[PDB]
Design a protein around this ligand. Structure first.
Ligand SMILES: O=C(NCc1cccs1)N1CCN(C(=O)c2cccs2)CC1
Length: 121
Protein backbone atom coordinates (compact mmCIF):
# COMPACT_ATOMS: atom_id res chain seq x y z
CA UNK A 1 0.00 0.00 0.00
CA UNK A 2 2.49 2.65 -1.20
CA UNK A 3 0.26 5.79 -1.61
CA UNK A 4 2.52 8.70 -0.37
CA UNK A 5 -0.59 11.01 -0.05
CA UNK A 6 -3.00 8.63 1.78
CA UNK A 7 -2.03 9.93 5.29
CA UNK A 8 -3.96 13.19 4.76
CA UNK A 9 -7.48 11.72 4.47
CA UNK A 10 -6.51 9.12 7.18
CA UNK A 11 -5.70 12.05 9.52
CA UNK A 12 -8.95 13.92 8.53
CA UNK A 13 -10.90 10.70 9.44
CA UNK A 14 -9.04 10.37 12.82
CA UNK A 15 -9.67 14.10 13.65
CA UNK A 16 -13.40 13.51 12.94
CA UNK A 17 -13.37 10.55 15.43
CA UNK A 18 -11.58 12.75 18.04
CA UNK A 19 -14.21 15.54 17.56
CA UNK A 20 -17.02 12.92 18.30
CA UNK A 21 -15.21 11.84 21.56
CA UNK A 22 -16.65 13.64 24.64
CA UNK A 23 -13.04 13.52 25.99
CA UNK A 24 -11.95 16.03 23.32
CA UNK A 25 -14.29 18.90 24.25
CA UNK A 26 -11.67 20.84 26.35
CA UNK A 27 -9.01 20.55 23.56
CA UNK A 28 -11.23 21.50 20.54
CA UNK A 29 -10.50 25.26 20.62
CA UNK A 30 -7.55 27.38 21.88
CA UNK A 31 -7.54 27.80 25.71
CA UNK A 32 -9.18 31.04 26.98
CA UNK A 33 -6.80 33.23 29.10
CA UNK A 34 -9.75 35.14 30.71
CA UNK A 35 -10.68 31.93 32.67
CA UNK A 36 -7.06 30.58 32.98
CA UNK A 37 -5.16 33.86 33.62
CA UNK A 38 -1.76 32.17 34.29
CA UNK A 39 -1.98 29.84 31.19
CA UNK A 40 0.67 31.64 29.04
CA UNK A 41 3.00 31.93 32.13
CA UNK A 42 3.20 28.07 32.03
CA UNK A 43 2.62 27.21 28.29
CA UNK A 44 4.98 28.59 25.58
CA UNK A 45 3.12 27.11 22.55
CA UNK A 46 -0.70 26.70 22.82
CA UNK A 47 -2.21 24.00 20.57
CA UNK A 48 -5.74 22.63 20.02
CA UNK A 49 -7.53 20.24 17.61
CA UNK A 50 -9.21 23.05 15.59
CA UNK A 51 -5.71 24.56 14.87
CA UNK A 52 -4.50 21.05 13.83
CA UNK A 53 -7.51 20.52 11.49
CA UNK A 54 -7.13 24.02 9.94
CA UNK A 55 -3.31 23.48 9.42
CA UNK A 56 -4.07 20.14 7.68
CA UNK A 57 -6.84 21.62 5.44
CA UNK A 58 -4.62 24.63 4.55
CA UNK A 59 -2.00 22.19 3.14
CA UNK A 60 0.52 23.31 5.78
CA UNK A 61 1.61 19.84 7.04
CA UNK A 62 4.14 18.03 4.79
CA UNK A 63 3.87 14.64 6.69
CA UNK A 64 1.83 12.88 9.35
CA UNK A 65 4.90 13.16 11.65
CA UNK A 66 4.40 16.96 11.76
CA UNK A 67 0.65 16.56 12.55
CA UNK A 68 1.57 13.97 15.25
CA UNK A 69 4.03 16.47 16.85
CA UNK A 70 1.28 19.14 17.16
CA UNK A 71 -1.30 16.62 18.60
CA UNK A 72 1.32 15.41 21.13
CA UNK A 73 1.85 19.15 22.09
CA UNK A 74 -1.91 19.37 23.03
CA UNK A 75 -1.35 16.51 25.51
CA UNK A 76 2.04 17.75 26.89
CA UNK A 77 0.46 21.21 27.44
CA UNK A 78 -2.37 19.62 29.48
CA UNK A 79 0.19 17.62 31.60
CA UNK A 80 2.28 20.81 32.17
CA UNK A 81 -0.77 22.92 33.18
CA UNK A 82 -2.49 20.33 35.49
CA UNK A 83 -2.22 21.12 39.25
CA UNK A 84 -2.83 17.39 39.88
CA UNK A 85 -2.61 13.97 38.15
CA UNK A 86 -6.24 13.43 39.42
CA UNK A 87 -7.69 16.48 37.52
CA UNK A 88 -10.75 16.06 35.23
CA UNK A 89 -9.21 17.78 32.17
CA UNK A 90 -5.82 15.99 32.48
CA UNK A 91 -7.60 12.59 32.99
CA UNK A 92 -9.59 13.27 29.74
CA UNK A 93 -6.26 14.08 27.98
CA UNK A 94 -4.75 10.70 28.98
CA UNK A 95 -7.72 8.72 27.55
CA UNK A 96 -7.76 10.79 24.34
CA UNK A 97 -3.97 10.40 23.96
CA UNK A 98 -4.27 6.56 24.21
CA UNK A 99 -6.99 6.63 21.55
CA UNK A 100 -4.96 8.88 19.25
CA UNK A 101 -1.74 6.80 19.59
CA UNK A 102 -3.68 3.53 18.91
CA UNK A 103 -5.00 5.01 15.58
CA UNK A 104 -1.96 7.12 14.37
CA UNK A 105 0.44 4.08 14.57
CA UNK A 106 -0.64 2.57 11.18
CA UNK A 107 -0.90 6.04 9.52
CA UNK A 108 2.79 6.69 10.34
CA UNK A 109 3.94 3.15 9.43
CA UNK A 110 2.11 3.21 6.03
CA UNK A 111 3.51 6.66 5.17
CA UNK A 112 7.14 5.79 6.02
CA UNK A 113 6.73 2.48 4.07
CA UNK A 114 5.41 4.41 1.02
CA UNK A 115 8.33 6.82 1.14
CA UNK A 116 10.85 3.97 1.34
CA UNK A 117 9.13 2.28 -1.66
CA UNK A 118 9.36 5.56 -3.62
CA UNK A 119 13.20 5.60 -3.02
CA UNK A 120 13.64 1.78 -3.51
CA UNK A 121 15.73 2.05 -6.80
O1 LIG B 1 -10.01 26.08 28.80
C1 LIG B 1 -9.45 25.16 28.18
N1 LIG B 1 -9.74 24.93 26.88
C2 LIG B 1 -10.98 25.38 26.27
C3 LIG B 1 -12.19 24.72 26.86
C4 LIG B 1 -12.31 24.10 28.12
C5 LIG B 1 -13.52 23.39 28.19
C6 LIG B 1 -14.39 23.72 27.21
S1 LIG B 1 -13.67 24.66 26.00
N2 LIG B 1 -8.61 24.31 28.80
C7 LIG B 1 -8.05 23.09 28.20
C8 LIG B 1 -6.56 22.98 28.46
N3 LIG B 1 -6.34 23.05 29.90
C9 LIG B 1 -5.84 21.98 30.53
O2 LIG B 1 -5.30 21.08 29.90
C10 LIG B 1 -5.99 21.82 31.94
C11 LIG B 1 -6.86 22.42 32.84
C12 LIG B 1 -6.80 21.80 34.11
C13 LIG B 1 -5.82 20.88 34.20
S2 LIG B 1 -5.02 20.62 32.72
C14 LIG B 1 -6.76 24.34 30.44
C15 LIG B 1 -8.25 24.50 30.21
Amino acid sequence: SYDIQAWKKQCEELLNLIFQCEDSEPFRQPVDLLEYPDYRDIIDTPMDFATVRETLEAGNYESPMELCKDVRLIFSNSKAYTPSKRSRIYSMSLRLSAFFEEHISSVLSDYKSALRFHKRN
